[PDB]
Design a protein around this ligand. Sequence first.
Ligand SMILES: Nc1ncnc2c1ncn2[C@@H]1O[C@H](COP(=O)(O)OP(=O)(O)NP(=O)(O)O)[C@@H](O)[C@H]1O
Ligand SMILES: [Mg+2]
Length: 213
Amino acid sequence: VETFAFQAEIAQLMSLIINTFYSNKEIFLRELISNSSDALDKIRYESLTDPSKLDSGKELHINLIPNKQDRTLTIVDTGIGMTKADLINNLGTIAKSGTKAFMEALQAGADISMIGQFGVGFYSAYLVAEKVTVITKHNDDEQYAWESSAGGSFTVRTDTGEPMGRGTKVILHLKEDQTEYLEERRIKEIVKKHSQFIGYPITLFVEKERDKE
Ligand SMILES: Nc1ncnc2c1ncn2[C@@H]1O[C@H](COP(=O)(O)OP(=O)(O)NP(=O)(O)O)[C@@H](O)[C@H]1O
Ligand SMILES: [Mg+2]
């Protein structure tokens, strides 16, 4: 297991999100679905000139999986996935130009929904999750797990769980006061409100239901 420090302003932002009350938390799901959609676009365009890039799975889609027993909401996609280097670089160690401006905007009363416009959309996960685990598989790298409960660092390790062919799974270990995001109707209404124009199928597990479509 390897441990990495978040870039200082990203650590500051995470602390702010965790320790300051914001309403409109539901936008975390929009932000994670947008990341899945971007990752799906990436592999889709790569496959146009190299169809073998889909040998690890031709289906391009997003699954939403609430688990009441474990108190987790998982967002799974069959997108491009992240290499080990991608995880380390893109999910915490590299500065984002908009972080300080976003924190200033929040102090001045901006809605937390603006997070994506400032280039730090992923960190919305910490509005509702005490811990986030990201399991990811990119072509020509092994499967990896990134994890953080905030507090300034994250870990990366090779994953020995169930193999994914290709893509990313973001596992949200929800705070005890945010279990509404495990409910079928709640998830449906947030997807309808915020993610209605995503151009890939989105499936909800309750047994299994295509949204919606
Ligand atoms: N599901 C995923 N699949 C592949 N890469 C991902 C996924 N989620 C996040 N990433 C990577 O993590 C980076 C940071 O995500 P994020 O903080 O959401 O910023 P962003 O998507 O680049 N810009 P924005 O969300 O519009 O503020 C992305 O740019 C990707 O490189
Ligand atoms: Mg994003």
